[model samples]
Target: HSGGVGALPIHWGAPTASERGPVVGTTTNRAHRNVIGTHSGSYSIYRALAVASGALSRHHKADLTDTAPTNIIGPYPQWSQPGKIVSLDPWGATVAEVFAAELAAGHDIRPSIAVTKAHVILPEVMEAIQKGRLHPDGRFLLPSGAALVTKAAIEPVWHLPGVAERFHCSETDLRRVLFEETGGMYPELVTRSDLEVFLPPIGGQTVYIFGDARDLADPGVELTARVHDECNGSDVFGSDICTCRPYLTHAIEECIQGAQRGGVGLVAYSRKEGRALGEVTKFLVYNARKRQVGGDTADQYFARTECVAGVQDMRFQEMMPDVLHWLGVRKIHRLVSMSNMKYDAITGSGIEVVERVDLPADLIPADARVEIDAKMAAGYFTPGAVPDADELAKVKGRELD
Candidate 1:
């Protein structure tokens, strides 16, 4: 119900090429970037740790009392390797002392490393301006503020602040598990922006980008895209319950051709199974369909699923398009999808859909008729994609002139 996707104005345009190290069609200048590696290779992702209030510091209430000059925070903080060591109140000067000193001298606290000033902030800003640790009741020393991993490094778990401690595992223990276990958790970075809202991130997706998606970053270029949620029974096992795999395959082929024509092909494959419902529920609904009194007709298709799951679908479109936004997509030349919901989400989130491309009619599968017909009756696809909804099955790579 809550996420960073809709929290603030989703930035439409931002500088793409900058001095900032590496990014992927990114708009979040304030974010630290990360790399997610897959069998297909790696793609860049950015993590922005947002402030709760634009003007107020997260630790605004707390003021430092007395701090030892020799106090070092966390594993020497991988950010500053062996550089000069100092605290926010490094010389043991609390806010009152600094305020008093500055009051006598002047009013400006410029470059003091004790003040935070900026609309857009980098994670390191918090590092220099304050200390990091568990919850702070007052200020200074160990409990000054929440510990943050600001710099981007390989597989650094950034999200879930105090995460290592939160899970009752010491940092050393967690690191031990990273390699010591046969089935270790994969690394993905989540930022304070999501935690600021207290919402867990919507899982992850494997982006299969072709023909250099960076070239599609420009507003003038029209990129081809497909936003597909996972359908295991169909996507992997080739279930004909719906047109899932067939449509996905079509989109992939179309994207390949699109790339060959010198345009980019972006297939944003998300892991939202059974419309965000898990596999068990989806299988339960399959039984509900075949066991129906009428036995699987288009009339009761949606009704059967709703009866089983209490809702027909659970793919929350509101925040779904945030990934497309991250890919630096401004305008999609031809969107290879028929779902109006997906179309609306992408367009609503700020990317413009220049044209919508449908899976050619002659290619639909016969076993998928009930699913297709029901969705069409429910007004799922645009009028353009509806006529061919229930008619084509010859396209198991059946191409013709």
Candidate 2:
């Protein structure tokens, strides 16, 4: 408390303490198993046992090294149960025999840990398994020879018989899985498995569309669309989506054409629809604004929509990046971003925004676009919008800069 009011603690950003102990390591790669060790849980296990005394705790970040001792993260998955060390090679040798040879000779076997099901067993292990150095009945011979124990060398494999028999296929299930996964219809005329395993053509795919102060993720941020019940009119949704869709489509076609000519151009999924605003809000804001300012000065809708009163308290700069990252996007170039807000939100969410394309008014419907362009041409970005910058910046805990 300070002067009878609550006070925030001063943050001096002082140095913190650390403990010295045994070093530990883990592994990571481009994909799952290669990068599996990067998981804190996997690395912590190695860190604890490496310690001569005190163990690493979750609160403290685990210290890891560039190398890992065992090729596999822990026990080999195929041999992780009770009595056997099942040989899972598509051909002769099992993974265990191959691992033993490397550990014995002190040879590097990093590949095994990075292995996918596609990798084959090593030649030497295949030869030995064929000659029965490993028991034909699928048990690894106990190590009684010179190889010293570093970490545990042996683990068990289990056989869960009839595991496949538990599954029952029904006609209804096939349709359910398809509908659940793709959000597409599988008509009654087609059988479930009869559907094609086709990858969509991306010959003309556009990686990005640059335009107006609209966020692609926000609902109703673009195309100025609206939904009306009979109470309003003919439930008609008048939108400029049709007109602008072609421009974006043509832009994408050009990108594909450029790539075909050995030039690089990236075209991606989202381009304008106000980053988070959906079609309904885009038009709703316009429709609502038209009634107040008359249809003549419709461009004010953008600033009006951006006003603090129009935005939900929970909506922040953190949402869109989360959505894009999960969709396998790492960065967007010539991004149609609205304000500096995208820089903060996207970067904070761990995606890159290489370049931004100021929203061009031409991309909006001609009517609204002309009005906005004229306003912007007149040096007014706020147009007819309410709570213009000076007023709303206070709600955002900021002052005009």
Candidate 3:
């Protein structure tokens, strides 16, 4: 909660436009300004669209197309899309860094997202919900109504941090153990840190076992910073672990800080272990299943864990409404949610998604028609680039005849 047992502040004014200029709104090239050009092709553009649906959906299509820059913001021209604001995910930082390097040579270009020093709306959403201006949705929108009605399931495999090296096991050996223990193992693993919480980082892929799945147990799974060929700028920190710890800590702190201030609601969640799988379970699925079935079969076997709807059991739209009503929150202004797979998981829960923190605009696209089609194609969109919740409102603007 952001404090207080009452109403929350609402930024009812129109969204502020960029200062330098208006975005071209048509290209996808990282070097040029065109949504289509900037994104490289329809595929990447589609990915961007998927992410955006999870965040803001308020503006009209013309508003979105008119506002978004075709490429990263730069000196090609300043006075372009002034009122348009763009958002970026942490992954988008690579592009920013690239632009910065180019700018030092007089290239002069800012990131397209136009990140501000402004505070995120998560706290406000939470506060509104608490004081009856919001609603409760699932942890992340990963699972949705589409998932509830699907035919296939996604089995998530988990790997133990150090199990790869322990017992002198091959991935073949590790896979079998995981299948024996759980259902299957995650295809890969990423552990952000070892317990102790220091910056320098200690240890490699040593075998560490978890006592439980709730919290970071003592002697958790071991992980290493293997040199992945995929990192754009391969360096020592390239393949470092991205533990769920930080995400959890951030969410918890937000809640606690908001509550201390007397706010009624807040939005905070600890995710990020594996695409959607938690660290321990993600690794365990892999460590437990591979050998019994082999990689191919194991993949198919674990894929069944998820329902055709893509959710494990409950549907976000089905359960959240009553849960919030029972909590004494009757109405909400907005909410901070992680997934874009469903509309109104928040709104249906009786809260509006005002703003989403930490999520990049890439998750939410500037287009809506593209979003729905892509979701149907992917069968169930679970990962990166889900749009922000507010984008829905933006897409439906001035529609009456």
Ranking by lDDT: 1, 2, 3
Please identify model 3 stretches exceeding 4 Å from their true place.
1-245, 260-262, 266-284, 288-317, 330-334, 341-343, 359-401
Q: What TM-score goes with each of the models? A: 0.50, 0.28, 0.23
In candidate 1, which residue pairs get closer than 3 Å at backbone N, Cα or C atoms, i.e. clash? 364-392
- Candidate 3 global Cα RMSD: 24.5
Over the stretch 183-253, how does candidate 2's per-residue lDDT look in tens digits?
55423213423321211111111122122112323322221110000111111233442223323333333
Off by over 4 Å in 2: 1-238, 241-247, 261-283, 294-299, 302-309, 312-317, 323-333, 336-340, 350-352, 358-364, 370-401
Worst-scoring 10-residue span by lDDT in model 2 = 225-234
Top candidate on lDDT is 1
Give the TM-score comparing model 3 with the true structure, all chains together.
0.23
Runs of candidate 1 exceeding 4 Å displacement: 1-202, 382-401
How much does each candidate deviate from the true structure in C-alpha RMSD? 21.8, 27.4, 24.5
Candidate 1 global Cα RMSD: 21.8
* lDDT for each candidate structure: 0.46, 0.29, 0.26
Q: Name the candidate, 1 or 3, with the larger lDDT value.
A: 1
